[PDB]
Amino acid sequence: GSARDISSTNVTDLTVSPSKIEDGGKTTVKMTFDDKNGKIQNGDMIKVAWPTSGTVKIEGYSKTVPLTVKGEQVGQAVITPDGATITFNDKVEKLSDVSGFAEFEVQGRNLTQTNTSDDKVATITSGNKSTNVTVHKSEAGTSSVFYYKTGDMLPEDTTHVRWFLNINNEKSYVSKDITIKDQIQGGQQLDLSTLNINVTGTHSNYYSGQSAITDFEKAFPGSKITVDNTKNTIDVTIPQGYGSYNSFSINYKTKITNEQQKEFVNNSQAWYQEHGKEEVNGKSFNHTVHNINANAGIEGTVK
Amino acid sequence: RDISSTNVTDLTVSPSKIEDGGKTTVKMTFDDKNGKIQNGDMIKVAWPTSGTVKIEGYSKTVPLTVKGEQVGQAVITPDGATITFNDKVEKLSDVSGFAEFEVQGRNLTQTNTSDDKVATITSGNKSTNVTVHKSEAGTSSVFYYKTGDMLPEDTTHVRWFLNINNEKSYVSKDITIKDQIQGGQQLDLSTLNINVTGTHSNYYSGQSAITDFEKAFPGSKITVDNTKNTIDVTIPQGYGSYNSFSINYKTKITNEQQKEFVNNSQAWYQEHGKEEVNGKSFNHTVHNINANAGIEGTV
């Protein structure tokens, strides 16, 4: 099973949709190829490369889109946060005038450890063609947010959606008990084995795996995490005697049951009071996470 | 060192009676007869900053210069005017200077009909009276009107507003407007913002403001030529109905000595029931601000 890196001979164009993105932003990368300069054989590979280390990091979302024509898998697009590689099968050695593409979403990251508004460029390469992408890191805002909800999708895991219940982020004294109800919407399924609590401050500790819930409830006398599996409901109550001077980060991954669903929602309510600031009673903190778009088309003529 | 009380000779206000939004030249004069002016000496001219009558000082910085020597500095702020003297003034013996600047007269009285409230401007120990007039709202249901202004905090750029379909009524023809920005000023594309209110409620500002408006409202197009200073806005009748479009931009002044700034427009609209309008001239003019400061001394 021998292979060839035919990217330098067969790549036609390399398109990147948004040439200017923000830090952590998504980017549509399109690679076009044809056999007008060399016939595509079994083992042939098109390799798409990008900066993987330093101040500019480019992380492609892990997806697998097969190049299929008339029910025959002639190739396959393999996407990895460190590089994309397209491998063709022996089922293509019977087609002529072959021309196709590999379109996928890639996360752009700015890692310049310097103050003030910053712009940094990243050059994605595929064969002869190379494209420049700008990633912007805006100046950091003032840290003054008590409770908020955030969902994440890792380039190393596109099957699960990360959810974060960040409580008392500024280590502030909490005047009331912190109660948060959570309703996970359709298209996904809650995984209990992933549920982890990351307390940071006076009573700092990381609780994860099996005993994760009970370890938190025992260590913080009064605290309660309640999970409904089928309904996808997580109700968490933390006492004020432990909520003060501590940042509670509740993280859980939800297994995607529908890849065709374009975005994922999770609704949450909050009950808290930061000492000095005003109290919150049942305010809705809802967050939406976008899925990943990826395609790989191929045209060919038989006989 | 505040020396306003012991040096101000006369405080003067030009137009005594003005309308709500009018401008007023305020002259201040100081002497050296009642004591020497030194380094760190301050002359303050104060006016009502909040209430029924608000006075807004147009932001300017005019230096007190005598024969190639800047002995003082006069700064105007929408809250007060401070005149600071440098160490270079401690060479002159007989000093007599002035500082005249324009301020905005505002009548914030929220009461029924015509209202006249006096605003008293103070400088040291001298006082003056300014009458501001509110003139009651009308029944003028203008479809398309153009009006610009200059903010007392920003005197370097000129605001211009393109208010389309203000009474958000049914429209029978695609609304088209042409904008011709005149000389002495330059278009700033960053300040160009769109504000939609009515059936559709949106506000697009900065950078991609034009693109975001064109994407969200299919059919609508804003043609901006930067070097020639020409804006052409075309909105389809399907979106132009029941929506008030507010297109505002700032125009950077490239001529501080210019007397007034002009801006022309041509409207193309058919408001259902009323008359058809084809290429009618909707022109507006913004008045410029004049600020002066002069010092007179002898060795």
Partner: peptide, 30 residues
């Protein structure tokens, strides 16, 4: 042994784009 906790939440976003210019004033008389 066991791997570490997930990283600390990133620096909060920028600042909201300045509000729209206010509503137009009352119409004038004669």
């Amino acid at each position: 042994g066991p791997p570490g906790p997930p990283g600390p939440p990133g620096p909060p976003g920028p600042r909201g784009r300045t509000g729209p210019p206010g509503p137009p004033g009352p119409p004038g008389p004669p």
